[PDB]
Structure formats: C-alpha cells, structure tokens
Amino acid sequence: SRLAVAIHILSLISMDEKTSSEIIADSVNTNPVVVRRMISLLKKADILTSRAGVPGASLKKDPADISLLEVYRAVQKNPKCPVGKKIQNALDETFESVQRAMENELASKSLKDVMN
Template identity: 50%
Template sequence: MINTRFAVAIHILSLVASTKEREKLTSDWIAASVNTNPVVIRRISGMLKKAGLLESQVGIPGSILTKLPSNITLLEVYKAVQPKEELFALHDKPNPECPVGKRIQSTLDDVFHSIQTEMESKLASQTLQDVLDHLFQ
C-alpha cells in the first residue's frame, strides 16, 4: 500500500531543488514545511540518500540533489521510499470450494500486476522537474 512517504519524499526533493540557501535545509526547516516531525524527514532523507538521489556532508547543514531534477524520475523516488512489496495486497486463503474463492487470487494477481505496471510506467515518464514546473507556474 502506498503511504505518505512518497509524497513527503517529493516534497523534500522539491525543497532541496528550489531552495538556494543550503544551510536552511535542516530537517527542522523541512519538517516545518511538510508539517511533520524532523525524525520523519531524516528517515525519508536517509532513504533518498541510500537511493543516490540526495547527498550531504558531515558538519555541513542541508543536502543537495545528486542529479538535475529533469533526470530524477518519480519512479526512482517511489522505489526509494516504498517497501518492495506489491501495491495491492490479496487476502489470504479464500475458500477453495467457492467458485469465486478458488480463482479470485489468480484473477486479481493479473489485474493488480497490470495496474502496477501502468502506474510505474507513468511514474517513469514524470520527473521532479515536472513537479517543480507545476509548483512554480
């Protein structure tokens, strides 16, 4: 299931991309913009660093993008902060004696896989720059 990490990650990257004063980009400052706890910002920023999207240096406040916003796809961001599980979860152990129950999982597997593939394709075609262009138009 998608949680708010994806939206918060895009928020963080948008702030980093659009804020000229790197020293402002503390987890407290970003947390105030997101309206969340700085611990949440540090956790998600850590995921973005591990994915190679953000870079920071010890003793220097703030982070920088590792590539241009036009080269960061929303799919990269999504994969950086979402669990590796599928987007949709199936319920366990439907009744195999039921005509629907015995085939529902394989049917939904196909449907859900198709939807996830389409979503990932759309995310791959959108960049952080697209988000920034929309934010500041």
C-alpha cells in the first residue's frame, strides 16, 4: 500500500528538519523515486507545501488536521447473461457500502493519531 509509505514520509516530515527526499527514502528504506513521486502527489493534494531553496518540504497543516482518508485519496490509484449483470449491480453497490466503511475509518484517524 502507498498509504503506509505516504504515512512514514509524512511522519518524518512532521519533525520538520529540512529533510531531503533522499534521506527520507533512506530513513524509510524505500526507493527515492517512489518517495519523490509520493511527495509530488501529497503536495498536489496540497498536503505538503514546499519552499524551494530548501530540501524536502513540510506539512501545510497540523498533523491533527490530516486524516488518513485525506492521505489515501492523494495517493489513491464479464458477464453476458442478463441475470449475471443484475447480480453484478447488486455486488457493485455492496462493494460501495464496504468501500464507504473502509473510507469512514480512514477519516476517523489522524496523522497525529498514529504518531505516538
């Protein structure tokens, strides 16, 4: 999951130590292209602000105001018979109920919530 990697990244950025992306990948023990990518997305989602002429970036807001769900989206990625299709629709909506559930927890926790 990219969520986890996005979380480690954000955690370290929490400390706000002008930590470069490289160091983060090292510290996170992950490829630094992934890290930079994750970081462009997070910024694209305005979760992270950057201040060129300064390595890395930093939280646009406070960790207590950053939901995991909020993080998720930012890094978020037969049959033919008529009967089959029908059922398909049933299925389709259920997966939306479970989906909303998944999504509802992620909105319950905060970045701060994990950092402890």
